[PDB]
Structure 1
Amino acid sequence: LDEHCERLPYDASKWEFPRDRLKLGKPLGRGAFGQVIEADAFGIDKTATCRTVAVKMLKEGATHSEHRALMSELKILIHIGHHLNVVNLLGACTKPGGPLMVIVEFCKFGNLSTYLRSKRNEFVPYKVAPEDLYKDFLTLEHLICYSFQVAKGMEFLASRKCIHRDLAARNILLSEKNVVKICDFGLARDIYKDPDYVRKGDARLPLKWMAPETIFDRVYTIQSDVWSFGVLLWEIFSLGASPYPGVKIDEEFCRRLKEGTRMRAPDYTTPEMYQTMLDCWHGEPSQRPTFSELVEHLGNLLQAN
């Protein structure tokens, strides 16, 4: 349903937020045409209550084309609706006389890739008593829990007849109480400056996260998102490392992938988590597990840990 966003409704009576009730703060991230800014919203969700929020909007360089694209994003977010494991829509500023602003929940710890890399040194597979009891270290339980939460958010997205198309640790945010949320920075990330995006024809694509049918046939489905989820699991159990270490991402890489060549196990995985990665990387899309099947499997592993 996310391929024909323009026909979806925008109910202003429900979502419109007055610009004079939003106090803009410091930028969080910038792209070539879009940006994310921290802000304080007065009464966006609870009467007369100040709340820190994140705002996606355009910047110098954007044109009417990017303005149309951001309005389509707002319409699809309303259709999708809310879930604990997605970055949720709170309101929007669309009235003439100012910029289009899409207001979402603030996630204080930022992206999961940087977070896990920053905490790599503190990791312990299992917390052993007594010295570790009052220390806030990352454990195998935390990593399986983040994996389970992302599968729940993706199962929810699939139920709304939508697909992600850029699933990766850089597009997962961490909030309070160990809650992780799927997001899409889109225009607010500078893909022409980012090493995770490689030139392929004319566009800059996230080659290291793409299923072979996406690379070779330009096919995007919920099952190509399952392949990307497999790459995301490798990022989690490597504690924020970059995929395919030391491999040149060229014509040769794509051919080896198409023939069945795969990544080796990351340094902090369990045998069952590595087998889950291999299952998400089946060459045949219909033979990869579904997000509903991954939710069941990871829920059972989390309880077993």
Structure 2
Amino acid sequence: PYDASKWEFPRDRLKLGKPLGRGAFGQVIEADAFGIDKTATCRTVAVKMLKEGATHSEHRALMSELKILIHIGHHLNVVNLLGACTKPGGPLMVIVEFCKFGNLSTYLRSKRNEFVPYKVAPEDLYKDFLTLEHLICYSFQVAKGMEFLASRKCIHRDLAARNILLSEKNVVKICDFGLARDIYKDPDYVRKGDARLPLKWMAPETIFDRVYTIQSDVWSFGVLLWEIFSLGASPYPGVKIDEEFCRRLKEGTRMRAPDYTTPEMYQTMLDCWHGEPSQRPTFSELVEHLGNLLQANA
């Protein structure tokens, strides 16, 4: 359902700005919302809306997404829904908290040179570098977000570092650009049947049987871990994404360890990549595991 008394935000109280992500039919825009949260307070927000080319079907899909985000609720590691513009005579707009640093994939890749496994040096004390603690922390935060989302009976279907955002104080948030990404222009999406699917993140039961579950999200999570500990590299490097790739993956062929991983983190990847979906760990198990890794790290 949609409770307008709670979620409806007047279009006039929203000041639209620069594009944040653009698709063919959808887009995410930066905006200035007046009193969306705390009474009479300006706040930077990100708005998802449709663009030229979009049809009634994309409009329907955007309303479903808004209703799903309403149903989800608040969690520190899930992008937070602030409101919506659903009234006639204007476009449908889904408003969320702004995440300053953008997607995790671009962010890690940009900071790849500023990576030091451990900050042991006394001179390095006052420098904003990426450490193994930071990477384990992001991995653990995504798992807490995915555990929360699992408890809400949701399935993501496109978990990847491109769908993780970085906010202030190293807080990561799960998101879904969806229509705000041009998948027909994007290389992470490969043509399979009548659609463009994120093949490199998909579990084998999804590539062949089109079966999406919380455990197939765990597989994607394993691929996301590879993205994190590769510092934003593209999965399966040098591999042609075709029928031979799909065949080998079902047989048990896995990715090699990324250049910045710890043996245990690659083991956690391998566990997430177990062929049988029931044998892959749960998000609740990954929270405790990654939580222990972060406590041992200190």
- Same fold by TM-score, threshold 0.5 exceeded? yes
The 3-state SS of whatever aligns with 2:75 is coil
The 3-state SS of whatever aligns with 2:45 is strand
**Alignment partners' CA distance in 2, 1:169 and 1:26:** 22
Aligned match for 1:266, one of 258, 266, 278: 258
**Alignment partners' CA distance in 1, 2:249 and 2:59:** 37
The 3-state SS of whatever aligns with 1:29 is strand
The 3-state SS of whatever aligns with 2:125 is coil
Unaligned runs of 5+ in 1: 1-8
Task: Give the superposition deviation at 1:142.
Answer: 0.2
The 3-state SS of whatever aligns with 1:132 is helix
1:167-226 per-residue CA deviation (whole Å, 9 max, x = no partner) reads: 000000000000000000010000000000000011000000000000111111000000
The 3-state SS of whatever aligns with 2:94 is strand
**Alignment partners' CA distance in 2, 1:34 and 1:81:** 23
The 3-state SS of whatever aligns with 1:274 is helix
Over the matched positions of the two proteins, sequence identity in percent amounts to: 100
Aligned match for 1:207, one of 194, 199, 203: 199
Residue 48 in 1 paired to residue 40 in 2? yes
Paired residues in the alignment total 297
Task: Give the superposition deviation at 1:53.
Answer: 0.3
1:4-39 per-residue CA deviation (whole Å, 9 max, x = no partner) reads: xxxxx1000110001110001111111010011100
Task: Give the superposition deviation at 1:243.
Answer: 0.3
Residue 38 in 1 paired to residue 36 in 2? no
Task: Give the superposition deviation at 1:276.
Answer: 0.3
**Alignment partners' CA distance in 1, 2:191 and 2:117:** 38
**Alignment partners' CA distance in 1, 2:14 and 2:107:** 28
Task: Give the superposition deviation at 1:130.
Answer: 1.2
Task: Give the superposition deviation at 1:129.
Answer: 2.9
1:235-266 per-residue CA deviation (whole Å, 9 max, x = no partner) reads: 00000000001000000000000000110000
Aligned match for 1:165, one of 154, 157, 163: 157
1:105-133 per-residue CA deviation (whole Å, 9 max, x = no partner) reads: 00000000000000000100001231110
What RMSD in Å do the two structures reach over aligned CA positions? 0.5
**Alignment partners' CA distance in 1, 2:290 and 2:273:** 17
Unaligned runs of 5+ in 2: none
Residue 253 in 1 paired to residue 245 in 2? yes
1:41-97 per-residue CA deviation (whole Å, 9 max, x = no partner) reads: 000001111000000000000011111111111111101101000001000011111
The 3-state SS of whatever aligns with 2:124 is coil
Q: Which runs of 4+ in 1 moved over 3 A?
A: none
Trace 1:147-166 onto structure 2 (pairs within 5 A).
Answer: 147-166=139-158
**Alignment partners' CA distance in 2, 1:293 and 1:28:** 34
Give the TM-score normalised by structure 2. Answer: 0.99
**Alignment partners' CA distance in 2, 1:220 and 1:68:** 21
